[PDB]
Amino acid sequence: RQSWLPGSQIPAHLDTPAAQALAGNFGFDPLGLGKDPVALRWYQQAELIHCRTAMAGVAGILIPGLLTKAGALNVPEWYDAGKVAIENSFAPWGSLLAVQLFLCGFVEAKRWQDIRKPGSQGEPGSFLGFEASLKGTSELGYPGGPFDPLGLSKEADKWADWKLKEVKNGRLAMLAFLGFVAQKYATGAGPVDNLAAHLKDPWHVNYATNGVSLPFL
Amino acid sequence: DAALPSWMPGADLPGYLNGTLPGDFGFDPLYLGQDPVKLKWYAQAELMNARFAMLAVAGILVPELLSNIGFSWPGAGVAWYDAGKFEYFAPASSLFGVQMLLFAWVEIRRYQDFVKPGSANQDPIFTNNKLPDGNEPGYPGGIFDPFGWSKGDIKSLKLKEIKNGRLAMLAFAGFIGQAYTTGTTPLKNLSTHLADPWSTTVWQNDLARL
Amino acid sequence: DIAGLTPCSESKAYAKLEKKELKTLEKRLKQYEADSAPAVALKATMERTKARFANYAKAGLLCGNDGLPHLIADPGLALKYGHAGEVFIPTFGFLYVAGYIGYVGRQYLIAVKGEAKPTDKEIIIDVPLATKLAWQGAGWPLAAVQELQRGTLLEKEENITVSPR
Amino acid sequence: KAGNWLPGSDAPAWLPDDLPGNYGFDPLSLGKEPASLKRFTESEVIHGRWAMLGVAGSLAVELLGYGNWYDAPLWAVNGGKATWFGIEVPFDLNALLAFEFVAMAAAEGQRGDAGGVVYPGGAFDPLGFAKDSSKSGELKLKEIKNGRLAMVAFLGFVAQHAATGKGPIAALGEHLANPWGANFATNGISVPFF
Ligand code: CLA
Ligand code: CLA
Ligand code: CLA
Ligand code: CLA
Ligand SMILES: CC1=C[C@H](O)CC(C)(C)[C@H]1/C=C/C(C)=C/C=C/C(C)=C/C=C/C=C(C)/C=C/C=C(C)/C=C/C1=C(C)C[C@H](O)CC1(C)C
Ligand SMILES: CC1=C[C@H](O)CC(C)(C)[C@H]1/C=C/C(C)=C/C=C/C(C)=C/C=C/C=C(C)/C=C/C=C(C)/C=C/C1=C(C)C[C@H](O)CC1(C)C
Ligand SMILES: CC1=C(/C=C/C(C)=C/C=C/C(C)=C\C=C\C=C(C)\C=C\C=C(C)\C=C\C2=C(C)C[C@H](O)CC2(C)C)C(C)(C)CCC1
Asked: What is d(CA B60, CA B57) in angstroms, rounded to the nearest whole number?
């Protein structure tokens, strides 16, 4: 049993067979927010969505940023790409955000109804015949059909491993984006610039010398 | 856990490496091959990486070896890392697209035979042409072995293949390292080291840049 | 700007008040030495006054005809003219700390209510349980929303005593 | 079955063997339910017929010297009159949308009221090329295959136009003149790094 703190008392709500089936269960819940099974299920869905969104965003920030350091690309910084993209664009940010909110609200409402009732999106005669593929699998937050075209989820032997690689990576991405914000408010440069500046001199270029993270020193 | 050759005489090797795969020496300190499916995938990955590295090392060393002698041809003084920005009959983008389509076809066929052995031995156009029934993933044979070299000691030849592949993989890694540090072609580095090996080592060369 | 007020960085009465405060402090300082404790204390007070006036003007506060800062409590005006730091953010900050305290106290009462003598625990505070609940109360809004959604936050009408009407 | 899309793979059990153009291609399991398979089958046949008409029209209009498929409705963007085979048409964009809407609504309503019929016959087959049901299965396979090829061709038309700017006939001549120098890899948007 892997634990987030060797020797600490793992909470009872995270030791049940239902909670142990979740990917990345390390018994980490000091505030006890997952004591309620319904709340735990809802938070599991929230964590999965956060993991996938953070992975996509951090990838979209790191890969183009790393390619910009070399001569492969010329993508601006993540904190300035919005203005540059909206300058030579066909629509203002408000109209684009409205269209985005409508398109995202439709799929988010369908996902919400599936969370409230699993497999309820497969109601016949409701989505032009595509409702048959809108039914998720036996595990909430892991649907098939149009999603997962390669069919890598059909093999159970690697399934338990695959989920472990999705949550963990996602958690790392969730921290990465957080760092991307903090560094932006502490150095004023991009993440690749901060990485290069730290690699040039780690004993003097870190958060202990930025003058913000340690105001008492 | 047997009399098979080991990478450390006397060490307690893991039990999942029983000598079935070629070149098994019980070398796995990180235990990356604990999962049988992961080990099955890593075997094919090692074979493919080894063969591509062998072709790469041969294609890096042969032009430089022929360039140092009287043999001459269009691309002679160009280094292996400088061959990309060379003037060819077609642009690099077109060649990249053509090779991506061709490699997509052969790689999907290889993957199909990997997930189902013997399911891709039949030629789609010519129904008469086919590979022999007895086959294993990563070892096609048939038209790929027209000389029938596999009819002899397949174990010894497989051991030779995996050993040469590992050596070529390390050689390609060394090519990248030498090109990034010395900034010169590998045979020139070999000649420089052979001129005076006592004063031309990795420690001396790297200390001169510190 | 809002309500006919002017920014404190441009108000003449604001600068006049700053000059008046510095003038009375300097007048009091004129009777002491130059390297004594009252002189250093008065100089520190003067520097604090200058820093306070500069910080209030830098914050973008609106000053009235009296030269004193005026707060904006309307969320629309505060979010539209950059005044959310006056009454909005401190509102949510107080709500978080107040709900924190209330949730921790409620959890302690519910925890000690199932013991042999709850009144004894009410007069003699169980420090380990109180400390554990105080640390676990950081997620009070999420826990409170979950308790409200499950129906365990409130008590039924049949279990609460009432007067004979 | 018509064949195997992936050699060595097993055909899905939800695809009937007598279905025209059944190559066993369904990795996403979209037609798993029988009710969805019927609608998708009719939709695929209708899409193939419309795509065949569209590709034939685009090829004919660009081969006859009357512009490409993209510049056809440009007359109603800057002021002009539509011309069919070099003959002027006095119908403006406003009268075209109304007549097309009424005609298409009536025809599609009549077609949909039959309960999703894919092969009506009778008035739609005056020559009687599919009178016997024995040869009907073979011709249906040709129809679905030509329709799939036309759908792929129309997608290629749109993609190549959005990538280069020229029409399908102009793109074919350029590729025939310089195959290595003119392809999808040299447009500048398909491959970003190169
Ligand atoms: C096929 C393996 C191989 C071989 C034969 C060589 C050979 C050589 N390297 Mg090299 N190298 C290698 C791998 C290899 N390297 C790898 C994997 C890296 C990391 C990326 C490097 C990084 C490197 C640098 C930075 C430098 C060299 C340099 C050199 C040259 C002389 C100094 C030296 O030996 O440094 C020491 C080499 C090593 C510490 C590599 C470790 C030993 C490898 C793994 C071989 C294992 C030995 C094995 C029993 C095989 C023996 C040889 C066999 C063919 C008979 C020399 C000709 C120097 C040079 O370029 O000269 C100007 C130089 O500065 N190498
Ligand atoms: C506690 C009681 C309270 C009171 C008395 C007010 C009073 C006021 N609010 Mg308000 N508001 C409140 C709570 C309150 N608010 C809360 C809890 C929120 C958070 C949801 C908001 C968020 C809010 C916004 C975003 C805005 C106001 C605005 C206003 C002013 C005019 C609009 C109005 O009267 O309709 C009642 C307010 C609402 C129903 C909220 C929606 C805003 C309505 C639709 C009007 C907005 C249209 C336009 C901006 C009107 C001004 C036109 C022109 C002068 C620019 C007005 C003095 C508007 C304003 O003057 O901006 C500076 C403004 O846009 N409020
Ligand atoms: C567990 C502590 C607790 C909690 C959760 C509440 C909660 C509540 N009280 Mg209450 N109250 C408390 C203690 C508490 N009170 C105490 C100790 C007193 C005696 C001074 C009162 C006297 C009181 C009155 C007279 C009224 C309320 C009212 C209310 C309700 C309106 C919100 C409010 O804050 O009013 C204001 C509450 C206060 C001003 C007193 C709060 C005292 C402190 C901040 C609570 C800390 C308690 C304890 C020391 C901390 C736990 C320690 C533990 C971990 C060991 C609300 C549900 C109102 C009501 O009837 O509902 C509509 C009302 O009229 N309370
Ligand atoms: C929208 C047109 C369309 C429709 C409705 C169908 C429907 C069907 N096809 Mg078919 N097919 C099509 C186009 C279409 N196809 C094209 C263009 C090709 C050539 C590549 C094929 C080739 C093909 C083969 C080889 C086979 C089928 C088969 C089938 C049947 C199996 C059920 C199924 O797979 O789910 C239903 C399918 C759908 C509901 C289509 C979903 C549409 C998705 C979203 C398209 C995604 C593509 C993407 C958007 C491309 C645009 C790029 C973007 C950036 C703009 C089914 C009735 C199998 C069969 O048994 O034949 C009877 C089979 O063997 N199809
Ligand atoms: C568990 C627990 C429980 C216990 O009891 C207690 C405690 C301790 C409290 C805990 C913990 C918690 C935590 C840590 C949390 C965190 C989270 C996060 C961070 C998220 C993020 C998350 C994040 C996310 C999603 C993100 C995303 C991102 C994105 C999209 C991006 C985008 C973009 C791009 C691309 C580029 C451009 O240019 C810009 C932009 C537009 C910007
Ligand atoms: C099967 C499946 C299932 C599994 O499971 C999965 C997946 C993979 C998803 C799948 C696949 C899918 C696909 C491929 C799809 C596609 C489709 C298409 C392409 C369509 C088109 C389609 C197309 C179409 C109709 C088209 C049409 C066209 C037209 C009309 C045209 C017209 C015209 C012309 C004449 C010319 C002029 O100048 C203009 C106009 C007037 C404009
Ligand atoms: C979770 C919690 C506690 C429970 C608290 C409960 C049960 C609260 C219930 C409240 C109920 C039933 C109704 C509340 C209605 C609230 C209303 C009508 C207030 C609306 C707000 C308005 C009109 C505007 C406010 C303002 C905004 C947002 C920003 C600025 O403040 C300025 C201003 C005034 C405009 C327990 C158990 C004591 C434990 C501990 C914390």
From this structure: 5
